[PDB]
């Protein structure tokens, strides 16, 4: 619960998951439409250790960091 990203994101999904007490959140880049950016990320509070956040980033941003 100290998430931080050099990027900007919009929501894609938010759903409960098999075997987990905590829901998974799905995000895609704020520049998906304007720049065709393919970068996505998934965020889910860890089942085993409730203090830990699991985050997966997929594909690379096709633009510099939003300054």
């Amino acid at each position: 619960i100290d998430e931080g990203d050099l990027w900007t994101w919009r929501k894609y999904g938010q759903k409960d998951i098999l075997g987990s007490r905590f829901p998974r959140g799905y995000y895609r880049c704020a520049y998906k439409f304007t720049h065709g950016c393919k970068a996505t990320k998934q965020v889910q509070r860890s089942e085993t250790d409730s203090n830990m956040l699991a985050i997966t980033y997929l594909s690379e941003h096709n633009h510099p960091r939003p300054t």
């Binding site: 894609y12 999904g13 938010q14 759903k15 409960d16 998951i17 905590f22 996505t40 997929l58």
Partner: protein, 335 residues
């Protein structure tokens, strides 16, 4: 290579077996997840079969399974798209003009849609049985997402509804929603026309606005288009009564031939039982692997009824239909 009889037997047998387990589970008031029954897999496998059957049972339903980009990403998706599913963009590029219903798999979640395609373009009205975002502004994003998969020039409405409370019931709920869309074919057609003409949607739905980036119509309250009959499988009594409290005119209409109102029918389906403990709206969860809740059975019963219908259909279907369904099942079980 096998006979029509054998294949027919393998398809109805699959459906009957699913039915046997689900009916046992329901009769014993057991949660499938806790009972370690693989609902996700079975739902995924039966859905193409249900769609074939419902399409035959209701000429003009024209239901098609579609999926989005994420559904093709092995690293993100919860499971592969169902057998025979087509990418949204391939469908909008190639389908004959006409009126379709769809179940749309986004990789993790399935929604219902009513699609109109003609020479002047495509419009889609998406109804999501899940409304889990605390912050409603989030749905702007969702609306934009679906729009950009149908293409910028497609007109799109996105309507999230608070029906689903479980992690797995989206497919059956979406199937049911599509049946209801067909049932209300005229009202959805009227909304399509309004989307295409860029007209005032406030005559069709209660809360609506266009998104800034794609101009999609986000509908944060779909009544009266989303009517009482579309809320019948709402799993939380609190969701159903909140709906009825918001739209009292919906509280007096019969939602079936037994002349039950929505409220009455929902209370009849209330059961109490143990499910996996999961976080609530503000992400708080108690200790222990389970919690006891009270919720409506309706979707469970629906799945069972749909399976009965499909088995019945297959039992007497002509050989080409049997061969198509056998290939759909075979391709499903490949996962």
């Amino acid at each position: 290579q096998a006979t029509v009889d054998r294949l027919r037997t393998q398809v109805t047998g699959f459906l009957s077996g699913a039915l046997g387990k689900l009916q046992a589970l329901s009769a014993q008031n057991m949660d499938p997840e806790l009972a370690q029954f693989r609902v996700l897999d079975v739902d995924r496998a039966i859905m193409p079969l249900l769609i074939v059957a419902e399409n035959a049972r209701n000429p003009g339903l024209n239901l098609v399974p579609l999926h989005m980009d994420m559904a093709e990403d092995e690293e993100v998706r919860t499971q592969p798209p169902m057998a025979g599913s087509r990418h949204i963009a391939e469908f909008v590029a190639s389908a004959r003009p006409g009126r379709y219903r769809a179940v749309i798999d986004d990789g993790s979640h399935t929604r219902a849609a009513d699609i109109r395609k003609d020479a002047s373009g495509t419009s889609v009205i998406v109804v999501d049985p899940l409304r889990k975002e605390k912050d409603e502004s989030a749905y702007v994003d969702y609306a934009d997402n679906v729009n950009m998969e149908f293409g910028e020039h497609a007109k799109c409405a996105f309507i999230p509804v608070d029906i689903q409370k479980s992690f797995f019931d989206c497919r059956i709920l979406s199937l049911s929603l599509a049946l209801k869309m067909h049932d209300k074919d005229d009202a959805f057609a009227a909304f399509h026309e309004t989307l295409r003409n860029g007209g005032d949607p406030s005559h069709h739905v209660s809360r609506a606005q266009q998104t800034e980036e794609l101009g999609a119509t986000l509908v944060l309250d779909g009544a009266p288009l989303v009517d009482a009959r579309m809320m019948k499988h709402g799993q939380a009594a609190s969701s159903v009564s909140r709906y009825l409290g918001n739209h009292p005119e919906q509280s007096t209409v019969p939602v079936n031939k037994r002349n039950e109102t929505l409220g009455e029918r929902t209370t009849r389906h209330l059961v109490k039982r143990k499910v996996r403990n999961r976080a609530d709206s503000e992400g708080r969860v108690t200790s222990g692997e389970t919690k006891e809740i009270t919720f409506s059975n309706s979707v469970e019963q629906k799945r069972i009824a749909l399976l009965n219908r499909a088995a019945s259909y297959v039992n007497s279907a002509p050989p080409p239909v049997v061969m198509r369904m056998a290939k759909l099942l075979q391709d499903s079980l490949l996962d």
